[PDB]
Amino acid sequence: ISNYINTIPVEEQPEYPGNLELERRIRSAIRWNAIMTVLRASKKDLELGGHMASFQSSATIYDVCFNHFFRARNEQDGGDLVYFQGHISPGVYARAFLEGRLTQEQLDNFRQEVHGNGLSSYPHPKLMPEFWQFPTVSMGLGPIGAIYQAKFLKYLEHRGLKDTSKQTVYAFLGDGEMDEPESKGAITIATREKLDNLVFVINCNLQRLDGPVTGNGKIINELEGIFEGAGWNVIKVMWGSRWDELLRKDTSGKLIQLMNETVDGDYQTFKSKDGAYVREHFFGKYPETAALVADWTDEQIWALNRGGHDPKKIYAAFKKAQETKGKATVILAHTIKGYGMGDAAMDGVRHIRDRFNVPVSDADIEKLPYITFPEGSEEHTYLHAQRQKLHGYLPSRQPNFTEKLELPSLQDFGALLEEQSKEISTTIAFVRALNVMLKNKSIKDRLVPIIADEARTFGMEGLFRQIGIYSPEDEKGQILQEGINELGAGCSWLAAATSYSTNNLPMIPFYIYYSMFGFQRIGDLCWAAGDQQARGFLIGGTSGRTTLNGEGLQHEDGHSHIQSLTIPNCISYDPAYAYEVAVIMHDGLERMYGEKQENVYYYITTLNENYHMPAMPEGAEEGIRKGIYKLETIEGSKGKVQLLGSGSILRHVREAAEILAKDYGVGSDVYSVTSFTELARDGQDCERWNMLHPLETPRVPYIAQVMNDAPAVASTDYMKLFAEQVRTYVPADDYRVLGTDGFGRSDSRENLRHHFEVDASYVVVAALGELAKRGEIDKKVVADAIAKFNIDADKVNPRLA
Amino acid sequence: ISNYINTIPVEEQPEYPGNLELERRIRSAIRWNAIMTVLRASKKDLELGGHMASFQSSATIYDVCFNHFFRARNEQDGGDLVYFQGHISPGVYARAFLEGRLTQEQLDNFRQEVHGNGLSSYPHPKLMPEFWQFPTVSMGLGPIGAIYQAKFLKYLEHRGLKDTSKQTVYAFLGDGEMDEPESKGAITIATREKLDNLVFVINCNLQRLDGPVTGNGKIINELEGIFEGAGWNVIKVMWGSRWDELLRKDTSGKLIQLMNETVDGDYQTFKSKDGAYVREHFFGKYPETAALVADWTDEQIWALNRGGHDPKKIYAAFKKAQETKGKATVILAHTIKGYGMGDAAMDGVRHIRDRFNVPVSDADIEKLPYITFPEGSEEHTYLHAQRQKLHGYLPSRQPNFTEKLELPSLQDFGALLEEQSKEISTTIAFVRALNVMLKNKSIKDRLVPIIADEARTFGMEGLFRQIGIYSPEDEKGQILQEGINELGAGCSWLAAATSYSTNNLPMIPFYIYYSMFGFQRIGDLCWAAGDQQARGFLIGGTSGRTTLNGEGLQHEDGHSHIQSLTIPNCISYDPAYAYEVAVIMHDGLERMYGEKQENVYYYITTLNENYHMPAMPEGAEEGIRKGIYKLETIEGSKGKVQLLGSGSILRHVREAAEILAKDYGVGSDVYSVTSFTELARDGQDCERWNMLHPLETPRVPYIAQVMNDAPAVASTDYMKLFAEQVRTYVPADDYRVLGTDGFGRSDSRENLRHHFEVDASYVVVAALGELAKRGEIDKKVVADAIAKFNIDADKVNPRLA
Ligand SMILES: Cc1ncc(C[n+]2csc(CCOP(=O)(O)OP(=O)(O)O)c2C)c(N)n1
Ligand SMILES: Cc1ncc(C[n+]2csc(CCOP(=O)(O)OP(=O)(O)O)c2C)c(N)n1
Ligand SMILES: [Mg+2]
Ligand SMILES: [Mg+2]
């Protein structure tokens, strides 16, 4: 930790290149319109919300960036990637409005978006696909997402895919937000990777929402201490220009001492007092410091400002950041929260108009008018000139990539469609499918395989020899090895999955990890990825409750699909078979990166269990994509049922079908369900359409088109709700679902499948139970099956075990 | 960063208090039994799994701790709280066996739990309630959990609730695991809170699973740099005692330079070679370093070891940490991964028996026999003597607390059971309920209100004046204000929620935060809390997709209940009314902290929307607890439907009920569903039991004892699955569910409820639709209703919007 003063002394401060007074006129209009936007929303009394205090404290920081640093998307690269702090969005809207990119009508619909001509509260690409780029409102996610975006830009350069050298990634953070573990938890990575294209800009107004970040301490010193410790270049923007004469005049060093010893809480109290209270409780702490302002009027003292409000000090910091190589830079900008808002942070509005010399007359003020700069005006000319020199306007977003990729055909995955000689797993199928893609000339170098330390567990090690590990194992390595860091891997996957938009360079990430540590562990990033329109694959390896058998409670995933079905634009599959994996991956590839350019990402759970992989039935492709297809029909004269299974448990349903027929003369239709979720969604879509078109012929869910009315039983390696979600659409009156509800534990697969009551013996007993409720067989036969299979009818419910 | 040598020079090292030769014998027997345990499991060929290399690298560190530092649970306090590294559990089991706490049959059932008297793969209290305490295998979670556990212990002391001053929290971490953002993301908190009762022990073997943490860097220096910068006391245990002579006679300072400049990758290469290789490639880098070992044999050079394997260096580090105050200490223990296994770091294990001089012939070795120390042997006596001096054995766990609390009765919440005077929200109801608890002499000081920065948003500010904010706003403050850090807040909640077991001191936490940032953001910790048998309350505030209307996409929660239903021992509720909040909170209190001592925690979503709160219907209490009860029946002669709602949408369902009756002559039963999830679980339980007992009187799902067979419609502020989950158990053939599937966006509550198709209008159309399909009313009536209500039947499905 250094003294509590600017890192860049005035003697090393470059001349400011802009027109300060003109820039302030423009900035005042931006401040005014931002406030107007929020107040007009408030007018409506619809509890719309919206903030003002934060943008007021960071406005000047952003203003210097828009006038002298931020590069917009251009023909060479995507421009600077700015992770705008979420709640200062009203300031971004105000500026875009002044630049003529948004209309008054849109500002007037700030926070009312359902009817189409509105503005989102925060940066949501999914809601404003041509405007926002990075969802930052969910705090903590901005900072780590930025780190990995910066890393991904270096990767694209190193791999010879795109020259991103002129791009800077800016993460605009709040100081309270730095308490999120995700905010500082990955900062050493920027040093390991020498991310000199990354700048963290922390607005140190010393406050969170409901109080100071650390009133009894010095949050700026805390941040400096740990970032410096992590190898970052730290630039503190502490004081404005008026302090420069005062500091060089302090030959005693007591002013510095005074500044260093004062704590956050006290600096914040001074901010509320007055110029007299200041010379008294601050400058008046020591005679030498009190003597420095002895010849100062109380008004001249109150004029002393924080560095984050002085364009000259701000500019020096971003310039130094821009010049720095070898490591990332973090700028700690000292500001006043609710700057110039006196009242809280009609008289209040008048105070603001006056404080910032806003060009709004007394006759118009009550109309809360927006201010505009006419073409020909000095303000209009300068606003646009500065931006034209930096390549246009931002933020802006391109929702589709321009190039046409020549994707592999399903035929290209032919070997995976045939019966397998060796027993393999769906994870081995996934790796083989990836190898098929790495043979495609068009996309082979666009693929981005990602792992979180573990590769061998997923049989990814063979790929290493072929494409190597990215390690600026060299700078040309293709695989991203992110270590024991699922959030980080997820952020790399997200940067890759959105490169198609950000850099007009489609990249296709496959991130494979232990499924339990996916949505459960990085779920907020997964939701953010949907907002960001990510197009990529999440492969949840070692999936299924009973299948990663020895690992136990915190590893056995019988519910990731329940978490994944909550994401609207995540498409989820739980395939059993080698060929389904191939069809599913080919289709996802086509949908996301073919002409359709569908904005969805995929989640495929894969397995670590080897078994016989049969050939794909002729014509089953569409059913596989839609979610279900009839695999086999077994003959039986005594009764008929339908049996459904997915992932590793389909095996055992299929065994149950043999037993039902051989031992009980009960025929069955047997379905592989590659996606209960896609089927449930299709069902809801049909039910919804039907309800809204009462005069039309009811539409039929795909699952109801595949199935008949015979009593049905489903079993999967996931909790019962996974299969129960399609109940409403299943055309049979009786539908019984078995599942792995309950905490996992270590044992053999056989023991866990019996414990969770999903194995063949339970499927059989479940099927006979339905046939008994129909009278087709005597209840006694079900009782006898239970004893026959050594099923303990009285063991505790697995959910409670 | 300091030089790459021990922090503690030999000169300041205390004399080792133990019997080194006897300790080594005992330690070798533990290493052996640990290996035997895993190899026997392997032989079964059931893919059980299990690690050996990591415990070998950390065995000596744990050994010094077990013999000289770890305090077991005792009469005065819970002893030291040791977060053992997940996957060195075989070593803990081996020591426990040697201590006579586990039988051979248990070791022989390592990773086969299902039949009882087995052992979990990792620390899972839910599975071994009297043994393990803290679930750590989900790497990342142990370090942050440990930080907040240490802070919680300080809180307990500061609040005068329990003298925890003699307890130390030890977090045993891997160096690769430190990459998880959660591992270092909160390390600054330990400094803010002066956690001198916290010791992080990082096993620096330089390796994660598939390779080095940073082969081209120095992971120990990275860790030292950031922890030092975060204000921690860092103690490096780099080199064993054989190096002391070398460092002492090297007046050139070259050995140190050489140690400093060598990177992790090269150090790992040395360990894979031999003495000659080290002499040439390490010491041979400089004439002076070559000179230091010129008269050493290659064997003597090869004997040089890493500090983490020398009991004397280990002891000095732990003793120093024990005397360090004002901040937490992190010990960076340098070790060799695959220690003593060398060749592969039945007989290929005789290398291990010879390496550690294990008393087993080259003929019994194939039988993988366990070593024990008979009562009376020098080893047995010493093993137990050292532990007795430390109060017994650990880990161990007490499942229930001993004291009896005198809990508030439901009548104590009587004011909340009456009609409220003004329109309030369920969040206001929650705060009023907490206030009733704060008046109970028995539990008032055991309550732990927890917030993540925002308090005003949840109306928690009034409490600040009453019970204060914990700030060691002073150290007697009761509310934990964790800032913008949901994971940290969750970790404080977890420490509080398990204090009943850990410290035999029941504390009752209530963590309120924005519901979107609950399971979605800290879901892996919520799963771990379940494993840890947490008993507390998670209050998801500002919940419901349409209800936190202006906030938009990353805030509007219409799915946390889908995430929460995945945790077996989380009981979830979405009440509509203040009296339901009261009944649920009272019941939860009695279940978890009353004589039942049920191992479940609660999740209650609450709202930020005010509306009329009617009085509780007489006798509705149990129905509120169970999940559903009938509110009223409205007459109508043209048809009959059932209408269900929960949370903020119930009042709109009631509006629909009035519209149906008054405009269409359609009567209704109206139900408030307080918990769709508990009803679904009850139904699954009933059906499971019935089908396993085909001849017995079947169990009737609770929901089926409340609802009848008239067509039903449900609507809630959550995606359709939340209400669909009970379909199988609803006793009506038509059950239509409305929900908030799709990404949220900013608008008025009215606009969002119409966009998400969940408002009164849609419920009416849904109900009329069912009647028309029964030919009870003309299909035209539905079409006209759609028109009358300005419903756009062709707008896109909200799930895709
Ligand atoms: C994960 C998450 N938790 C909580 C919030 C709610 N929130 C909105 S503004 C705010 C305070 C932000 O303080 P700080 O980061 O210091 O920024 P400032 O407004 O001072 O610039 C919080 C906690 C959020 N957006 N995301
Ligand atoms: C969140 C999470 N991700 C992945 C794993 C899988 N895993 C088991 S051991 C291991 C490597 C651990 O390396 P390190 O932390 O360095 O410990 P060591 O065994 O070297 O002492 C990993 C990643 C896990 N347990 N938890
Ligand atoms: Mg702040
Ligand atoms: Mg390691």
Closest CA to B401 of B547, B313, B500: B500
Closest CA to B603 of B513, B738, B693: B513
Beta strands A447-451; B570-573: pairing state: unpaired
Q: Which residue among B113, B562, B793 places its CB closest to the CB of A746?
A: B113
CB distance A442 to A406 below 8 Å = yes
CB distance A249 to A202 below 8 Å = no
Residue A339, CB half-sphere, CA atoms under 13 Å: how many? 26
Residue A419, CB half-sphere, CA atoms under 13 Å: how many? 4
CB distance B526 to B570 below 8 Å = yes
Sign of the torsion angle spanned by Cα atoms A84, A86, A91, A97: positive
Cβ neighbours for A435, distance < 8 A, ≥ 6 positions apart: A463, A466
d(CA A563, CA A518): 9
Task: Answer yes or no: is B207 a known binding residue.
Answer: yes
Tell which A residues from 557 to 596 touch B, by Cβ distance under 8 Å.
559, 562-563, 565-566, 568-569
* Whether A481 contacts chain B with CB within 8 A: yes
Determine the distance in angstroms separating the CA of A554 from the nearest CA of chain B, rounded to an integer.
7
Q: Residue B176, SS3?
A: helix
* Whether B139 contacts chain A with CB within 8 A: yes
Q: Give me the residues paired with residue A633 across strands.
A: A669
Chain centroid to Cα A473, Å, comes to 28
Indicate which ligand has the atom closest to the C-alpha of A209. Answer: 1
Q: Give me the residues paired with residue A82 across strands.
A: A170
What count of other Cβ atoms lies within 10 Å of the Cβ of residue A43? 11
- Closest atom of ligand 1 to CA, residue A213: 16
| DSSP character at residue A737 | E
Closest CA to A731 of A666, A605, A644, A615: A644
A20-43 helix and A89-98 helix, angle to the nearest 10 degrees: 120
User: What is the SS3 assignment for B343-358?
Assistant: HHCCCCCHHHHHHCCC
Beta strands A666-673; A628-634: pairing state: antiparallel
Q: Is B542 left (phi over 0), alpha (psi -120 to 50) or beta?
A: left
What is the edge-to-edge ordering of all strands in the sheet holding A169-174? A81-83, A169-174, A198-204, A329-334, A233-237
d(CA A143, CA A136): 8
Beta strands A447-451; A480-481: pairing state: parallel
Cβ neighbours for A441, distance < 8 A, ≥ 6 positions apart: A406
Closest CA to A712 of A601, A793, A630, A648: A630
- Closest atom of ligand 2 to CA, residue B87: 9
d(CA A53, CA A85): 13
Q: Is B337 in the pocket of ligand 2 (CB under 6 A)?
A: yes
* Chain B residues lying within 8 Å of A793, measured CB to CB: 692-693
Lookup: tokens for A240: 């404005």
CB contact under 8 A, A181 and B182: yes
Discontinuities after residues in chain A (C–N over 2.5 A) = 345, 472
Q: Is residue A46 packed enough to be buried (19+ CB in 10 Å), middle (13-18) or exposed (0-12)?
A: middle
How was this structure obtained? X-ray
d(CA B120, CA A17): 66
CB contact under 8 A, B523 and A519: yes
CATH code, residues A621-801: 3.40.50.920
Lookup: tokens for B274: 């031999």
What count of other Cβ atoms lies within 10 Å of the Cβ of residue B166? 12
Which residue's CA is the nearest one to ligand 1's atom 11? Answer: A209
- Domain B403-620 belongs to what topology? Rossmann fold (3.40.50)
Discontinuities after residues in chain B (C–N over 2.5 A) = 345, 472
Q: How far, in Å, is the centroid of ligand 3 from the Cα of A438?
A: 47
Task: Answer yes or no: is B485 a known binding residue.
Answer: no
- Closest atom of ligand 2 to CA, residue B213: 16
* Whether B400 contacts chain A with CB within 8 A: no
- Domain A1-402 belongs to what topology? Rossmann fold (3.40.50)
Q: Is residue A789 packed enough to be buried (19+ CB in 10 Å), middle (13-18) or exposed (0-12)?
A: middle
Q: Give me the residues paired with residue A670 across strands.
A: A632, A643
* Whether A456 contacts chain B with CB within 8 A: yes
Fill in the amino acid letter for B477: G
Q: Is B174 in the pocket of ligand 2 (CB under 6 A)?
A: yes
Tokens 């800032």: give the residue. Answer: B483
Q: How far is CA A111 from CA A47, B543, B749, in A?
A: 10, 18, 11
Closest CA to B562 of B518, B625, B510: B518
d(CA A479, CA A475): 10
Where do the domains of chain A lie?
1-402, 403-620, 621-801
In terms of CA atoms, which chain B residue is nearest residue A208? B453
Cβ neighbours for B195, distance < 8 A, ≥ 6 positions apart: B147, B150, B151, B154, B169, B189, B327, B328
* Chain A residues lying within 8 Å of B121, measured CB to CB: 550-552, 555, 746
| DSSP character at residue B4 | S
d(CA B305, CA B333): 12
In terms of CA atoms, which chain A residue is nearest residue B738? A688
CB distance B133 to B503 below 8 Å = no
Radius of gyration of chain B (CA): 31
Lookup: tokens for B748: 């008025």
B151 membership: H or E segment, kind and range: helix B141-158
Using alpha carbons only, what angle is made at residue B664 by residues B658 and B666, rounded to the nearest 5 degrees? 70
d(CA A111, CA B754): 16
Q: Which residues line ligand 1 (CB under 6 A)?
A: A 54, 87, 137-140, 174-177, 203, 205, 207-209, 337; B 453-454, 484, 486, 514, 517
Lookup: tokens for A783: 């009782």
CB distance A309 to A271 below 8 Å = no
A429-442: burial string, b at 16+ Cβ within 10 Å, e else:
bbbbbbebbbebee
